[PDB]
């Protein structure tokens, strides 16, 4: 009893949870969480790197502003007053 | 069937998602390195 | 403009009011011995070994301007006269010790020209490792083998 | 060239005849204490906190020219001498109070160099917030924390 | 028939009018933003 296809997109993906065995979806969820953590860690690193770039030009004196736009969203808003 | 870790998923569709990933973590890693490189250029400039 | 960083009641380095920011070397342990300055939020920058914040409006009149203009010759600093040449600031070895970081190197018109971070001993004279202004942007010159003061 | 804005019989700020326009800060309440000037049609500009109009032909001989040329040094203003440096006009704190807006900052040849709008107190000295001419066009410099006079 | 808000109107003809709108409010909004951008350029120039 079935003439439906597989999945598309995830939907059916969760339907399989009924087949195979017990362990499955929870492990996948954990993997997804790990991926999210990697994504979050990357972003945190990127922000720190963005600071590393705005460093030097963190003292004072004209000089961007300037490259502060084009400028990874701060850069500016930052140059100003 | 035949192997272990429950294989499931999707040609096409499957490729759609796969193609995304490998793709943003590597990007931000490369960008990080490039930012370091530029920083060193500034350090050299001083 | 110069304020001292204290750690366990002991002067470790200095802090300086240059431009519109409040500077102090990142490597210096302690907290600026000034209420107004101490409660600020500093932005660290490990590349420059710098750690700046913004000067409160009531002290902004107390800042010191700096300049990219530095022709070969002699400059002024607390312990005497620094010498600039070949793109390098130097001093008689012994005249600068740990705990001198943050101290500005003025010119004869008072413009801060660089800020000492440490020095490399190369015999008779020590090449200073300083934070200096370029065309407009900050920069850091660190002679080979510097000892971070 | 200088005319006073009055409000309920009380001087609030000033109005100035610069170039071929008649200026007065937008924030200043009142109406110029001069028949000819009062009946004019002003064009407000909230970005510049400026409010200009055109000088009647019979007063155009009474305007004051201004200039983009302003080298570091001392300038003249009603309360004394302003100091220009680092792209900032300043004065001894206390020498400028609310009700001084509109007052021009002349140089030694009489050319109006900027027009005071207010000032930010940064201790010993106050950085003025002024309207100044660029290459050809008007501009407004407002130090962090200005108190609009 | 079948739904609620009294549907009425016109293929073609219907498209003629529809194509107009979405079209002028958005334009003046974009132009407004562009004017602000240029204004900021002038502010930076000063």
Curated annotation (Swiss-Prot), chain A:
Disulfides per UniProt: 54-75
Ranges facing Cytoplasmic side: 47-81
PTM summary: Palmitoylated via thioester bonds. These palmitoylations may induce disruption of the C-terminus transmembrane. This would result in the reorientation of E2 C-terminus from lumenal to cytoplasmic side.
Lipidation (S-palmitoyl cysteine): 54, 74-75
Domain of life: Viruses
Signal peptide residues on this chain, from the entry's feature table: none
Membrane-spanning intervals of the chain: 26-46
Location of region: Transient transmembrane before p62-6K protein processing: 54-74
Full protein name: Spike glycoprotein E2
Organism field: Chikungunya virus (strain 37997)
Taxonomic lineage from the root: Viruses, Riboviria, Orthornavirae, Kitrinoviricota, Alsuviricetes
Whole-protein residues included: 668 to 748 of 1248
Curated annotation (Swiss-Prot), chains B, E:
PTM comment text: N-glycosylated.
Membrane association type: Single-pass type I membrane protein
Segments traversing the membrane: 23-43
Cytoplasmic-side segments: 44-46
Lipid addition sites, S-palmitoyl cysteine: 40
Subcellular location: Virion membrane; Host cell membrane
Lipid linkage positions (S-stearoyl cysteine): 40
Domain of life, source organism: Viruses
UniProt function note: Class II viral fusion protein. Fusion activity is inactive as long as E1 is bound to E2 in mature virion. After virus attachment to target cell via host MXRA8 and endocytosis, acidification of the endosome induce dissociation of E1/E2 heterodimer and concomitant trimerization of the E1 subunits. This E1 trimer is fusion active, and promotes release of viral nucleocapsid in cytoplasm after endosome and viral membrane fusion. Efficient fusion requires the presence of cholesterol and sphingolipid in the target membrane.
Complexes and interactors: Interacts with spike glycoprotein E2. The precursor of protein E3/E2 and E1 form a heterodimer shortly after synthesis. Processing of the precursor of protein E3/E2 into E2 and E3 results in a heterodimer of the spike glycoproteins E2 and E1. Spike at virion surface are constituted of three E2-E1 heterodimers. After target cell attachment and endocytosis, E1 change conformation to form homotrimers. Interacts with 6K protein. Interacts with host MXRA8; this interaction mediates virus entry. The interaction involves 2 adjacent E2-E1 heterodimers.
Protein name: Spike glycoprotein E1
Organism annotation: Chikungunya virus (strain 37997) (CHIKV)
Taxonomic placement: Viruses, Riboviria, Orthornavirae, Kitrinoviricota, Alsuviricetes
Parent-record interval covered: 1203 to 1248 of 1248
